[PDB]
Every structure is written in structure tokens, then in C-alpha cells.
Amino acid sequence: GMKSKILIFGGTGYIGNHMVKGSLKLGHPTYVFTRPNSSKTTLLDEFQSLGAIIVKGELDEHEKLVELMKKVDVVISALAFPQILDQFKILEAIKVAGNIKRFLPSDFGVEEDRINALPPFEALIERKRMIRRAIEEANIPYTYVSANCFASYFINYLLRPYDPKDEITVYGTGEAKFAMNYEQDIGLYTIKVATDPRALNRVVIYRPSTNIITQLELISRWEKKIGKKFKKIHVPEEEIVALTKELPEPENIPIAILHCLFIDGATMSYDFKENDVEASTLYPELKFTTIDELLDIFVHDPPPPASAAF
Ligand SMILES: NC(=O)c1ccc[n+]([C@@H]2O[C@H](COP(=O)([O-])OP(=O)(O)OC[C@H]3O[C@@H](n4cnc5c(N)ncnc54)[C@H](OP(=O)(O)O)[C@@H]3O)[C@@H](O)[C@H]2O)c1
């Protein structure tokens, strides 16, 4: 009816699929753009059964993008790091069509306009910054989502719950705080803020007070849940920094990211600004799945591990 029509790029993605599902669950007409040479016919078939409109095509098809933009109201990009600057193709189409009410570029991580990282990672987040600067210069309505850590992704990475090993690797001292959110919730909240006037042209941060923790605390709570103790093996900060300088690319990128999130504590190293919007405070009918609930999920029905593309 009056629900804004949402177009999602990278919808078959690791985080993108939760945005597609959240969109449909909220009653929004949902368009999913996907490459012709897909390996997700089963995933696309699921979206289709849920009401999604599938549009196959390449980002290089400028005319197709423009005609597609004219049919929707909101555009959300969940593309991967290798495709960050390819978002300029999306932006060009948005500018030509001229009817888009809100554009959310592919951020969904650290708040790159207030944090810095080691060269391997810094170079990549500068690409996201370039997208934001272009959006602002063109006066395109937007919302920048700092989702912080994808919870299933990093619980799997840090705890390797599917590994019966007796040791656990700790990065740095393990004392740095970080916030992590369940992917399913990042998906739903992103759709909500994309049409919330309170988020128009603002930075939105997902930092629920129940999802702030340190590596050491996460391990301790996990040990209690499963009744096992691990031998904590620390990897010195100086060691991690050296690796980012010697190891090749993309091998050194994940190392740089681990330093950013778990040693420097970039997701918790700042205080909110006047115009910042913390999403957990927005909807009284909704709440972010907490860390305790997340650990319970890994005990009962753990989601598969994942590895981002670099
Ligand atoms: N905060 C965190 O913890 C965290 C963790 C991981 C990722 N991220 C962020 O989340 C965002 C998305 O990451 P992701 O892991 O979800 O992405 P992804 O699943 O790797 O990729 C998303 C989609 O990109 C499309 N795609 C892939 N290669 C392409 C190409 N060459 N040309 C055009 N389209 C292509 C694919 O869709 P089709 O096959 O349908 O074309 C794919 O499903 C990024 O901004 C990333 O940095 C954050």
C-alpha cells in the first residue's frame, strides 16, 4: 500500500539476505538485484516464494539501473569490499533517476568517519568514505549504518564453536571492548531505519547495551555455557602489527581488521555525537538479540561460519 518500495543490491549476500528477509517481513515491496551467472538459484527461489521481485543484471547496465530506480523509493547496497567503488554505478543511476528517497551505502561495520585502522584495512574503509563524500556532494538522502560486529560471524571466528580444540586464540590482551549484533537483527533494523524520518541523513549506530563485551569475557561466558575450559593463547599486538606489513594482500587484511576490532577496540572507542542515532532506542516493540541469547543459539542450533571476501 503506502509501504516504500525497496531495492536491494547484494541481496543474496551474507548480510544482504537478512535485509531482504526483513524487508519482506515488514511488508515492503522488495526488489533484489543479482548477477545473471548466479550460484544462488535456491536462495533466490526462497526470496521469490517470500514475495521478492528478482531482477537479474550487471552493475554495468546503466540504462537498466536507471529504469529500475524509477520504480522504487529506497535503495540499499550490501555489496562486498571488492565492489565498494562499483557502488558509483549505483549512485550514478540514482542521480539520473532522481526519485530515490533514501540511499544506504554498504557500510555495516565500524564508523569509518571517526576511526582509523592499519593500512591494509584503512585503505578499504577509505573507499567507503569516498562513497559517503559523493552522496553528500550530490545531496542524495542517506543513512549511514554502523552495524558494528556481525555476531554469528565473529562468535564463529573467535570461539570456533565447531572445533573440539582445547585452546583458544586471544588477540592482544583481550581486554578491548567491542559490540556485536545478530545478523538477523541487523537486517531488520536496517530496513526500519531506512524509512524512519529519525534516521534521514544521519549516522545510525547499532550498540545495544546488552551486546558489549571483551574477548576474555566472551570466552568465560562460553565456557560456562558448554562446561569446558580452554587454554588461552595470546597473540601480542606488536606481532599482529608486524604481520600486516609482511604478509601479502588479502592475507594481511583480516589481521588488520582483528587489530581494529579486538585490540584497538574501534567499535567502542568513542562516545556518541549530538546527531548520532543509536538504533536500539528507536523501537519499543523491538529489541536486539542479546549476547546471552546468542550463546544459547550457538549451543542449540549454531549457524555456519563465514569468511568475507577481500
Ligand atoms: N561488521 C561486520 O562484522 C562485517 C562482516 C563481514 C562483512 N561486513 C560488511 O557487510 C557488507 C557486505 O558484506 P558481505 O560479506 O555480506 O558480502 P558478500 O556476501 O560477500 O557479497 C554480497 C553480494 O555481492 C554480489 N557480488 C559478488 N561479487 C560481485 C561482483 N564481482 N560484481 C557484482 N556483484 C557481486 C553477490 O550477489 P549476486 O551473486 O546476487 O550478484 C553477493 O551475494 C560490506 O560492506 C562488508 O564490509 C561487515
Binding-site members for NADP(+) are 12-15, 34-40, 81-83, 106-108, 128, 148-150
Cell of 9: 543490491
Q: Supply the DSSP string of 183-225, one letter for each residue.
A: HHHHHHHHHHHHT-GGGTTEEEE---GGGEEEHHHHHHHHHHH
With the most atoms of ligand 1 within 8 angstroms of its CB, the residue from 35, 43, 153, 185 to mutate is 35
Same domain as 48, residue 96: yes
| Experimental technique for the deposited model | X-ray
Backbone angles phi, psi at 97, to 5 degrees: -60, -45
Same domain as 92, residue 50: yes
In ligand 1, the atom with minimum distance to the C-alpha of 35 is: 41
Give first-to-last CA distance, the chain, whole Å.
40
Backbone angles phi, psi at 276, to 5 degrees: -70, 150
Residues 6+ apart with CB under 8 A from 295: 155, 221, 222, 225
Report CA torsion sign: 175, 176, 182, 188.
positive
Backbone angles phi, psi at 287, to 5 degrees: -150, 150
Residues with CB under 6 A from ligand 1: 10, 12-16, 34-35, 38, 40, 59, 78-81, 83, 106, 108-109, 147, 149-150, 153, 308-309
How far does Cα 205 stand from its chain's mean position? 11
* Separation between Cα atoms, residue 122 and residue 253, nearest integer Å: 9
Same domain as 289, residue 157: yes
Instruction: Give me the number of domains the chain comprises.
Output: 2
Same domain as 277, residue 165: no
Least Cα distance to 38 among 12, 2, 71, 9 occurs for: 12
Catalytic residue selected from 128, 224, 232, 287: 128
Residue showing cell 519499543: 284
CATH number at residue 160: 3.90.25.10
CA of 208 to the centre of ligand 1 (A): 24
Same domain as 161, residue 196: no
Domain that holds residue 190: 1-146+183-205+271-283
* Separation between Cα atoms, residue 83 and residue 162, nearest integer Å: 31
Type of residue found at 137: E
Same domain as 118, residue 21: yes
CATH number at residue 50: 3.40.50.720
CA atoms within 13 A on the CB side of 271: 1
> Residue 142 has what DSSP assignment?
B
Same domain as 57, residue 151: no
Residue showing cell 537478512: 18
Same domain as 159, residue 104: no
Cell of 63: 540504462
Backbone angles phi, psi at 46, to 5 degrees: -70, -45
* Separation between Cα atoms, residue 184 and residue 241, nearest integer Å: 33
* Separation between Cα atoms, residue 132 and residue 190, nearest integer Å: 17
Same domain as 74, residue 39: yes
β-pairing, 6-9 vs 167-171, is unpaired
> Residue 82 has what DSSP assignment?
G
Residue showing cell 543513512: 143
Strand partners, 56: 34
CA atoms within 13 A on the CB side of 48: 11
Cβ atoms of residues 180 and 148 within 8 Å: yes
Backbone angles phi, psi at 28, to 5 degrees: -85, 140
Type of residue found at 216: L
Same domain as 232, residue 174: yes
Q: Compute how many other C-beta atoms are within 10 angstroms of the C-beta atom of residue 146.
A: 23
Residue showing cell 524487508: 23
Cβ atoms of residues 189 and 286 within 8 Å: yes
Same domain as 288, residue 171: yes
Same domain as 30, residue 131: yes
Count of positions (residues) in the chain: 310
Burial class (CB within 10 angstroms; exposed 0-12, middle 13-18, buried 19+) of 275: exposed
With the most atoms of ligand 1 within 8 angstroms of its CB, the residue from 46, 90, 108 to mutate is 108
Quick check: helix, strand or coil at residue 166?
coil
* Separation between Cα atoms, residue 205 and residue 67, nearest integer Å: 32
CA atoms within 13 A on the CB side of 22: 24
Q: Compute how many other C-beta atoms are within 10 angstroms of the C-beta atom of residue 184.
A: 19
